[PDB]
Structure 1
Amino acid sequence: GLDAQLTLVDGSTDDVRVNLTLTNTGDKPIRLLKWQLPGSDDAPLFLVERDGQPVSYEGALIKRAAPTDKDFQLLKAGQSLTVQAEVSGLYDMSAQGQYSIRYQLPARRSESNAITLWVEGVNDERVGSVSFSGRCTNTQKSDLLTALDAASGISNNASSYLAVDKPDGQRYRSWFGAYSSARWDQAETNFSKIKDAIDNKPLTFDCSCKQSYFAYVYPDQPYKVYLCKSFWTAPVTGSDSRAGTIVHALSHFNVVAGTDDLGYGQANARNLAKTDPVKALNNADNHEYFAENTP
């Protein structure tokens, strides 16, 4: 028949990565339903419990047509398949406790052994709140909250600077260009609204984006930020940092500052401030670099 072993992958992370080995020990070949094998796509293939209580699946549920031939993975006599899958992104395992995980065996043409592990848990009151979607793992969840604390820091620093007007202010000149009291006031308003969203608004971070760039938002759908590959490749603080990407993305929301993405990068942002302060005050990266204030 079908032989399965589920094991926990060791690592210095809060991630719950499991390893499955499926072997055909039988006399004949066997076909296994492909979307019932744990890969990178979303499927509720695990039974997860916290202190004996079931933990709800969060991934996508999909309407598909009845499985045809094409949908089945072949396992020949003696052949084995080995695949890894992360569990904390599909099931909410952020709260601390003793968790149990079994793999739902794929249909052919019943469960694996259980593994049990301690989750130290995301130690944070926000989980003014922070929510997650698009398979953010336990580690991504923590890294995000760490990034948000830093975003709050530079965001506060920005507001603090904008409190007292300074016509010859270098920092301001750099990212917003030629001074006027009205233009200064616009940047100040913008930044206390960003700060307020960081500290007092229901935030949603999404880890589903697999695009090369940093992040994206739908400006009329507060407050959901989609995190892409360059956000993870980004440093926590500094230029084009994780903290700064958060300032950038939040500024877009119409209930925050309603900024556009007229241009990208410090150079373009600087040119915009000299070229058209009005454009600069309405550009997300200009607000990011103002806050990041990295030499």
Structure 2
Amino acid sequence: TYNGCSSSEQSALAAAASAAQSYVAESLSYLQTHTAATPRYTTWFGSYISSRHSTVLQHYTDMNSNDFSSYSFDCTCTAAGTFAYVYPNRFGTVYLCGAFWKAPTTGTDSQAGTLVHESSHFTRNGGTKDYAYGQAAAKSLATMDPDKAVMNADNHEYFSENNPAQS
């Protein structure tokens, strides 16, 4: 459903939700078939170990079961510098702000990637936190504190967006 969203915003959300669904799907498949260290994994989740891999696998297994297209979207926020926000304990509802509309549908820090980010925050999906923001801090977190990286929303977004792409 939509709340305070214009025709164009609903269309953008429709496209972003579908692309977010695909990101999560390809991301889950990747985690299920890659059970050893790979560039794409270590860059965003650090040194590969079974327990952490299971953690991220679980997050995507859960997010994959979500219906991004059925999320309750709210576009009343007009903050030009904010992308989106959610309440971890209030599942399926995403609040969009001004910066979301200026972001590309797919790619780095995209609308679709933003939904994957926010989705990971839901307690049902793993309850990720925001320990680091942006690709640079996300990669640094992966290198220095992998345990936090597998619990950081941006690291999930960047793992899914995979841009620049890695195997």
Q: What is the TM-score when the length of structure 1 is the normalising length?
A: 0.54
Deviation sequence 1:87-122 (CA, Å, 0-9, x none): xxxxxxxxxxxxxxxxxxxxxxxxxxxxxxxxxxxx
Would you say 1:140 and 2:22 are equivalent positions? no
**Residues 50-65 of structure 1: matches in 2 within 5 Å?**
none
Quick check: 1:165–1:184 contact (8 Å CA) kept in 2? Answer: no
1:242 aligns to 2:139 (yes or no): no
Q: Does 1:175 align with 2:39?
A: no
Structure 1 Cα separation of the partners of residues 24 and 113 of structure 2: 9
Verify: 1:188 aligned to 2:51, yes or no. Answer: no
Is 1:157 aligned to residue 16 of structure 2? no
Give how far 1:160 is off.
0.8
Residue 221 of structure 1 pairs with residue 117 of structure 2 = no
Task: Tell me how far apart the structure 2 counterparts of residues 223 and 189 of structure 1 sit (CA, whole Å).
Answer: 18
Structure-2 residue corresponding to 1:209: 77
Bigger Rg, which one: 1
Cα deviation, 1:228-260, whole Å, max 9, x if unaligned, reads: 111101000000001100000011010112000
> RCO higher in 1 or 2 (8 Å CA, sep ≥ 6)?
2
Name the one with the larger strand percent: 1
Superposition deviation, residue 217 in structure 1: 0.7
Q: How far off its partner does 1:202 sit? A: 4.5
Counterpart contact for 1:171–1:293, Cα < 8 Å: yes
Aligned CA-pair RMSD: 1.3
Q: TM-score normalized by structure 2?
A: 0.93
Note the residue ranges of structure 1 that are not aligned, 5 or more in a row: 1-130
Please report how far the alpha carbon of residue 261 of structure 1 lies from its aligned counterpart in structure 2 after TM superposition.
0.9
Structure (1 or 2) with the greater helix fraction: 2
Size of the aligned set, in residue pairs, is 163
Distance 1:223 1:250 in 2: 8
CA contact (8 A) 1:215 1:225 kept: yes
| Cα distance in 2 for residues equivalent to 1:234 and 1:202 | 21
Structure 1 residue 187, shift from structure 2 partner = 0.5
Tell me the percent identity.
Answer: 44
Structure 2 unaligned segments of length 5 or more: list them. Answer: none
Offset, 1:179? 0.8
